[PDB]
Each structure stands twice: as C-alpha cells, then as structure tokens.
Amino acid sequence: KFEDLGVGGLDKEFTKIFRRAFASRIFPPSVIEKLGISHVKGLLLYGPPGTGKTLIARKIGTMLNAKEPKIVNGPEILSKYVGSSEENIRNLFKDAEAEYRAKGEESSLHIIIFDELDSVFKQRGGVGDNVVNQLLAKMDGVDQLNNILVIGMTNRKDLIDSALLRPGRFEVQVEIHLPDEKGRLQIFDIQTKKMRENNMMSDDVNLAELAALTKNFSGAEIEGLVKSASSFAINKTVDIAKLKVTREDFLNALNDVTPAFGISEEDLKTCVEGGMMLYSERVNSILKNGARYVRQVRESDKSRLVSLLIHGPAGSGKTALAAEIALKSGFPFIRLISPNELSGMSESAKIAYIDNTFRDAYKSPLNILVIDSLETLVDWVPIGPRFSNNILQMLKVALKRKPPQDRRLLIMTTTSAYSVLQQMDILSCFDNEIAVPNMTNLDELNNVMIESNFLDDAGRVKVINELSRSCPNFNVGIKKTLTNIETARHDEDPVNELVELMTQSA
Amino acid sequence: GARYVRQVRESDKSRLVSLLIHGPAGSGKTALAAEIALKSGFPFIRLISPNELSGMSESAKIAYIDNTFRDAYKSPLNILVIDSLETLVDWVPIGPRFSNNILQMLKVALKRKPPQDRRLLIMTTTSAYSVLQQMDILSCFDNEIAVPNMTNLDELNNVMIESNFLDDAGRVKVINELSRSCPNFNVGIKKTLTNIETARHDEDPVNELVELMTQSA
Ligand SMILES: Nc1ncnc2c1ncn2[C@@H]1O[C@H](COP(=O)(O)OP(=O)(O)OP(=O)(O)O)[C@@H](O)[C@H]1O
Ligand SMILES: Nc1ncnc2c1ncn2[C@@H]1O[C@H](COP(=O)(O)OP(=O)(O)OP(=O)(O)O)[C@@H](O)[C@H]1O
Ligand SMILES: Nc1ncnc2c1ncn2[C@@H]1O[C@H](COP(=O)(O)OP(=O)(O)O)[C@@H](O)[C@H]1O
Numbered sequence: 212k213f214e215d216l217g218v219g220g221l222d223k224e225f226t227k228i229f230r231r232a233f234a235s236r237i238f239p240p241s242v243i244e245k246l247g248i249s250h251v252k253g254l255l256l257y258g259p260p261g262t263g264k265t266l267i268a269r270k271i272g273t274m275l276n277a278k279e280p281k282i283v284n285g286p287e288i289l290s291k292y293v294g295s296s297e298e299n300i301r302n303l304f305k306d307a308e309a310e311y312r313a314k315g316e317e318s319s320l321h322i323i324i325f326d327e328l329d330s331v332f333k334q335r336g337g338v339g340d341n342v343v344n345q346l347l348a349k350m351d352g353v354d355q356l357n358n359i360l361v362i363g364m365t366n367r368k369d370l371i372d373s374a375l376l377r378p379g380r381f382e383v384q385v386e387i388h389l390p391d392e393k394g395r396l397q398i399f400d401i402q403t404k405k406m407r408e409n410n411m412m413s414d415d416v417n418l419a420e421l422a423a424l425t426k427n428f429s430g431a432e433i434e435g436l437v438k439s440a441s442s443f444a445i446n447k448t449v450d451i452a453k454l455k456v457t458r459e460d461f462l463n464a465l466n467d468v469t470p471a472f473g474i475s476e477e478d479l480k481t482c483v484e485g486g487m488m489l490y491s492e493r494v495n496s497i498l499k500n501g502a503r504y505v506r507q508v509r510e511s512d513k514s515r516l517v518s519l520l521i522h523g524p525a526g527s528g529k530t531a532l533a534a535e536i537a538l539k540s541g542f543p544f545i546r547l548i549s550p551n552e553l554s555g556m557s558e559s560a561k562i563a564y565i566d567n568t569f570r571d572a573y574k575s576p577l578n579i580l581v582i583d584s585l586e587t588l589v590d591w592v593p594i595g596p597r598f599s600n601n602i603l604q605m606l607k608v609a610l611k612r613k614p615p616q617d618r619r620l621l622i623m624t625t626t627s628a629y630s631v632l633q634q635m636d637i638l639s640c641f642d643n644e645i646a647v648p649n650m651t652n653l654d655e656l657n658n659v660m661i662e663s664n665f666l667d668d669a670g671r672v673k674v675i676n677e678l679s680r681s682c683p684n685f686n687v688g689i690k691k692t693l694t695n696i697e698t699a700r701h702d703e704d705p706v707n708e709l710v711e712l713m714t715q716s717a
Numbered sequence: 718g719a720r721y722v723r724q725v726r727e728s729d730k731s732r733l734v735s736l737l738i739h740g741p742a743g744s745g746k747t748a749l750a751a752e753i754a755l756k757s758g759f760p761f762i763r764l765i766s767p768n769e770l771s772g773m774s775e776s777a778k779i780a781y782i783d784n785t786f787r788d789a790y791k792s793p794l795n796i797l798v799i800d801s802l803e804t805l806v807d808w809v810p811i812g813p814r815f816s817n818n819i820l821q822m823l824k825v826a827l828k829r830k831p832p833q834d835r836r837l838l839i840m841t842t843t844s845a846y847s848v849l850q851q852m853d854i855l856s857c858f859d860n861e862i863a864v865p866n867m868t869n870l871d872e873l874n875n876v877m878i879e880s881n882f883l884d885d886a887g888r889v890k891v892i893n894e895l896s897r898s899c900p901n902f903n904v905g906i907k908k909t910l911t912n913i914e915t916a917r918h919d920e921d922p923v924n925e926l927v928e929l930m931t932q933s934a
Contacts, residue, residue: 334780334784336780336784503919507915511918513914514915563772566771596811600807604804604807604809605772607804608767608804634810634811
C-alpha cells in the first residue's frame with residue numbers, strides 16, 4: 212500500500228502522488244486511449260533538506276518498473292565554453308527519444324532526477340537565459356514524446372521560472388514536512404528490522420518511549436542514532452554470537468547526537484559561564500516576567516508572535532538573563548544570533564545568514580530565537596554617524612512578520628543604547644520592554660563577595676566598613692564587581708587593591 | 718471605495734485611477750484596502766508587500782516590480798495593491814538616507830496608461846504623509862482617503878462586545894473607571910486588540926485592561 216516499502220510518515224502525499232501521476236499508466240491502454248488524455252510529465256517536490264525526497268523518488272521509480280534513474284545536480288551542468296553548458300541538458304533526452312522512435316507506444320518508462328533546481332533555473336529577463344530556454348524547448352516542444360518522467364527537488368520554490376510551472380511541464384507540486392510523533396515511530400519501525408528478526412535486539416527497548424524522546428529529528432538522524440548505538444554495543448562487547456543491544460546503548464547514542472533543528476546548548480551554556488547569583492530582589496522579578504511571557508506564547512491562540520526588548524546600562528549583565536530565561540523554558544527550537552558568528556563576512560553574506568536563520572524558524576511547531584546587541588550588528592559609530600542601512604531594514608522587516616500557518620515564535624533582543632534606537636525610529640517593532648538596573652548599594656556587594664568567597668569575614672567586614680565610610684553612592688555593574696574581586700584576590704591585601712579599585716570604578 | 722471600483726469598471730475615458738489611503742500608524746489601512754479589493758470581482762488581483770522583497774538586492778527588487786507591472790498589462794480588468802511605500806523605499810530619518818532608483822521607478826510607473834483598451838486600479842497605503850509631501854510625489858494620486866483613530870468610549874464598548882470580553886459587568890466597571898481615569902482617549906484598533914488579548918490571560922478583572930489602556934493612550 213504505502214509502507215510495505217521503506218517510507219514511513221508520508222501518507223497523504225503518497226496518495227496524492229499515486230492518484231495524479233500513476234492513475235493513467237496502470238489502466239488498460241484501450242480505456243485510456245478512449246478517454247483521450249495524455250500523461251503527466253513532471254513532478255516537483257520540495258522541502259527541508261534530509262527529509263526523504265530522494266528515497267521517495269527512487270521508490271517511485273522502482274515500483275513502476277522503468278530503467279535506472281539518471282541523476283544530476285544543478286551546479287554541475289555549467290561549463291565555460293560557449294555551447295557546452297546547454298549540450299549537457301540536451302544529452303539527457305537522447306535515449307528516450309531513440310527508444311520512442313524505434314518501438315513506439317510500447318516503450319519502457321524513463322526517469323530523470325534533477326537536484327537543486329533553484330540554482331541555475333531562475334527567472335529569465337547570459338548563460339542562465341540560454342539554459343532556461345534550452346530546457347523549456349525540450350520539456351514540451353514541437354516533437355511529441357510521452358515515455359518520460361522528470362522529477363525535481365528543491366528547498367525554495369519561489370525562485371523557479373514562472374513558465375516552468377505550467378500544466379504540461381511541472382504539473383504536480385508537493386510539500387514534505389518534518390515527521391510527526393507517529394512518523395518518528397514508523398521510521399523507527401522501518402529502521403530496526405534487521406536487528407529484530409535476526410534476534411540481536413534486547414527485549415527491554417520500548418520504541419514508543421524512544422520516539423517520544425526524539426523531537427524535531429529529521430529521519431536521517433534516526434538512522435545515525437541506531438547505527439551508532441549498534442556500534443557502541445559491539446565495541447563494548449569486544450560470546451561473539453550472543454551480542455545484544457540494550458536500552459543503555461540507545462540512550463547514550465541519543466545523548467551524543469545533536470539534531471539540526473534543535474537546541475544549541477553550548478552557546479547558551481558558555482554565555483552564562485559566570486553563574487547566576489541572586490544578589491537582590493530584582494532578579495527574581497525579571498525571571499518571573501520572562502516565564503510569564505514564555506507561558507503566554509505557549510498557551511495562546513491568536514498571539515502567534517511576541518517580540519521583547521531588554522535594555523539597561525552597559526555591563527549590567529543583560530545577555531545572561533536572556534540566556535537563563537531561554538534555558539528554563541523547554542522549547543525544542545532555540546537559536547542565537549551574536550556578533551561573534553557574523554564577524555569576518557561581507558555585507559551580502561551577513562544579510563544572507565540573518566535571513567536564512569529566520570527562514571528555518573518557520574518549519575517547527577514551537578520556537579525561540581535570541582538576538583544579541585542589535586547595535587553592533589548595525590555597525591554604529593557616533594562620529595558622522597555611520598551605520599549600515601541594509602541590515603537595519605532587514606531586521607526591521609523580520610521583526611514584524613507573523614510565522615506562516617499555525618506556528619509560534621518569541622523574539623527576545625538585548626540592547627544598551629535606547630536613545631539611538633529612539634532616534635532611528637525603530638521602537639514601534641517591540642511589544643514589551645524590560646529594564647536591567649545595576650547595583651546601587653553595599654549589602655549587595657557583601658552578598659556578592661560572600662557568594663564568591665573573596666576573603667574571610669574579617670577582611671570583608673573591614674573593606675565594607677571602609678567603603679561605607681568613603682563611598683556613599685556606589686554604582687557599578689556586576690561584571691566589573693566580579694573582575695575587580697578576582698584582581699584583588701590575586702593581588703595582595705584587601706584594602707590595598709579592592710577598596711581602591713572600587714573607589715576608582717564608582 | 719465601491720464608487721471608485723464602479724467608476725473604473727463601467728466607463729469610457731477613465732482607464733487609470735490612483736488612490737492614497739493615509740492615516741496614523743496602527744489605524745488599520747491595509748485591512749480596509751484588502752476588504753475593498755475582495756468585494757469587487759475583478760479577474761486579476763495582485764499585491765506587493767515588503768514581506769516578499771525580503772533579503773533581495775536592489776536590482777532584483779526593481780526587476781520584480783517591473784515584472785509585476787508588465788504582467789498587469791495582459792488582462793482586461795485588473796487591480797493592484799501596494800503597501801507602505803515608505804518601506805519599499807527604505808527610509809531612515811537620520812541623514813536622511815533612502816533609495817532613489819526605486820522611488821523614481823515607482824514614480825514613473827504610477828502614471829503610465831495600460832496598452833490598448835485595458836483598465837487598472839491602484840491602491841497604495843502609507844503612514845508618512847509629511848515625508849511624501851517633502852519628496853514632492855503627491856502629484857501622482859487622483860484622490861486621498863484618510864483613516865482616523867478611535868476617539869470615544871462607545872467605540873471601545875463596541876469593540877469589547879465584538880471581542881467577547883466585557884461580560885456586561887466588566888463592560889460597566891471598565892467604562893466607568895476610564896470615564897474619569899482618562900480625559901483624552903485615542904488609540905488604534907491593532908493596539909486595542911492586542912491589549913484585550915493580553916489582558917484576557919491574567920486578572921480578567923477590569924484592573925489589567927484599565928492599566929493597559931491608560932498606559933497605551
Ligand atoms: N544576575 C546575575 N547574577 C550574577 N552574575 C550575573 C548576572 N547577570 C549577569 N551576570 C554575569 O555577567 C557576566 C557577563 O555579563 P554580560 O556580558 O552578559 O553582560 P552585558 O551587560 O550583556 O554585556 P555588555 O557589556 O557586552 O553589554 C557573566 O559572566 C555572568 O556571570
Ligand atoms: N475597520 C476595521 N474593523 C475592525 N478591525 C479592523 C479594521 N481595520 C483593521 N482592523 C484590524 O486591524 C488588524 C490589522 O491591522 P493593519 O495591518 O490593517 O494595520 P496597519 O495600519 O497596516 O498597520 P501598520 O501601520 O503597523 O503597518 C487586524 O486585526 C484587523 O482586523
Ligand atoms: N520517511 C523515511 N523513512 C525511512 N528512511 C528515511 C525517511 N526519510 C529519510 N530517510 C533516510 O534518509 C536518507 C534519504 O536521504 P534524503 O533524506 O532523501 O536526502 P535528501 O532529503 O537531502 O534528498 C536515507 O538514509 C533514508 O533511510
């Protein structure tokens with residue numbers, strides 16, 4: 212029916228394909244001749260990479276007899292001699308034409324698989340125009356040819372020429388989603404079949420739990436997971452005929468693998484390497500508000516987009532709070548945009564990266580995406596002043612677009628130049644705002660130094676008393692506090708350095 | 718809008734009509750334009766938004782606009798909606814920087830008659846009337862509609878009854894509170910709806926909505 216072959220999770224799409232594509236190649240030729248209808252001569256199926264497009268193409272080829280598929284990929288076609296970039300697109304149709312001319316209407320179906328159709332075949336109006344014209348004149352031209360079928364696969368369907376998508380050239384258009392919970396269960400069933408019949412899979416593994424634990428897995432990462440678990444088991448063993456793979460191997464392999472549409476733990480973990488100390492009452496309120504907004508986004512029906520701004524004095528430790536709020540939510544898709552990643556690229560590459568990261572957040576059920584700085588991304592310098600308009604306009608457009616279909620998003624941006632944003636007139640894109648004030652007190656410093664154990668209580672008391680008698684209006688961020696504490700620790704005497712540093716810093 | 722559509726359909730000399738719907742930001746202009754478009758029946762309707770010219774290059778944007786306009790000249794009746802027009806010509810008020818080529822293209826393309834005996838109606842929205850005045854581009858439009866804000870409490874009550882939030886008692890309490898808690902009241906529909914939705918979650922009682930409306934206004 213559909214799953215007797217190796218494809219799981221794709222049910223509706225395959226019914227559509229079977230009804231529209233192979234509903235005229237199965238019936239007796241007499242009936243179809245009486246009806247007076249031709250055959251479909253194209254198929255464009257698009258979606259995120261690594262989801263099972265080539266597999267379905269090859270299975271379609273196999274299930275209908277047909278010769279071996281002829282495979283090609285976009286950028287390989289081009290050459291650097293006149294008339295060679297289009298000769299390659301002409302050599303793919305020779306054999307089918309010859310067989311059609313020789314045999315007639317009893318020929319055998321031929322298949323041609325095209326990969327990355329949006330790299331060369333872009334709207335015309337150069338080598339590109341010639342290539343598009345040469346394919347256009349060959350797919351449907353003056354000479355009839357109805358013993359062929361060409362499949363095309365792509366990830367961006369809104370760049371292909373507008374005449375290559377007309378009934379007669381590429382008639383059927385299909386979309387491939389990511390697997391659902393049942394899709395993952397079925398994929399697991401298909402993949403763990405050799406180890407099942409051959410009696411080398413323990414009786415403790417419960418694939419339902421494994422499917423439930425894997426979220427946003429793409430269907431190929433499952434294959435990697437199972438293979439890695441099997442390799443782990445064998446390598447642990449080396450009784451060679453008594454190998455058994457248990458739950459522990461699978462769980463370890465799962466722990467090792469990192470999905471492509473999942474959390475990026477390392478960055479969000481190194482962003483908070485200094486630790487989260489509750490030095491006052493504000494921190495709890497900030498975190499509570501963050502949690503409130505997370506919950507609102509999760510449980511709403513009409514609120515499918517929420518953009519949040521967090522701002523305050525420099526050094527107040529703003530990115531750490533955002534990272535902690537993100538790390539205590541549980542969403543399956545978390546991503547970060549920081550100046551470190553972008554540095555070194557050109558403006559065009561910067562825009563491309565900022566756009567692609569926003570186009571991968573519309574293919575998952577629940578997401579959360581963090582933007583850092585927002586003033587160094589725009590290249591701001593106060594003399595003249597200077598900055599980049601293109602990136603600014605890109606970010607402005609991206610912060611107001613609702614996600615497609617039924618999805619959800621929570622953008623969270625940090626800044627420390629409120630006034631500049633006000634001048635640029637960009638403050639209408641944000642829904643709610645949070646402020647992060649810095650330390651103005653002495654008990655806070657005492658709490659910080661007890662939590663960091665700067666010294667024994669004797670020196671701590673002495674230094675706090677000295678500062679109380681000297682500095683009345685202590686006002687500094689938490690980064691400078693920590694760095695000064697460390698510097699004093701590695702230096703000699705508390706009052707000699709710590710007090711002097713604090714006095715010169717406040 | 719209905720009058721203008723009817724004029725463009727059944728006439729002899731009017732073969733190109735422009736418009737300009739302008740008002741304060743958040744007043745809900747694009748919704749009105751879309752509603753006027755959906756109740757016409759014209760065979761051909763298309764829309765140009767900043768959401769589609771995202772991440773492109775300038776030349777690509779010009780080519781896209783050119784192709785759209787060219788495709789609009791091959792059918793008997795047509796309509797064409799344009800959004801912003803201060804964001805397509807990316808405008809930042811400091812310097813002030815913007816793009817001139819796209820501006821000139823749009824300025825030349827809004828005064829060209831369709832070939833032969835075709836007809837065309839164009840609706841373009843904006844929120845920077847003063848900027849357009851300064852650019853000296855206000856001569857390309859044949860008329861100008863205006864969209865104002867909300868300026869009464871009964872309108873808020875109507876919005877509430879339509880949004881299923883008041884529950885009668887809440888209506889009375891919140892209206893009475895805001896009667897003396899705010900002398901002047903002016904807010905767009907978008908922000909009002911957002912405030913209602915966010916108020917629904919926590920403390921459905923009048924307090925939350927009162928604070929939200931007071932701070933927003
Ligand atoms: N609430 C907090 N309690 C304790 N430490 C904190 C807190 N918030 C931030 N930090 C510390 O701040 C350190 C660095 O702060 P971070 O660089 O995030 O600050 P920032 O103000 O966003 O930076 P920038 O100066 O680049 O604008 C981290 O090592 C983290 O431990
Ligand atoms: N006449 C109306 N009656 C009821 N709701 C309306 C009306 N006009 C607009 N809306 C609402 O406005 C919301 C969308 O606002 P819209 O996009 O039209 O605003 P806008 O003026 O284009 O905004 P902006 O200036 O921020 O781009 C929708 O929720 C729509 O229902
Ligand atoms: N629905 C599925 N069922 C079983 N295996 C799948 C499925 N989808 C993808 N795969 C696995 O992914 C690989 C197929 O490559 P594919 O993802 O089609 O490449 P691309 O999608 O980039 O063309 C094979 O290893 C195949 O087993």
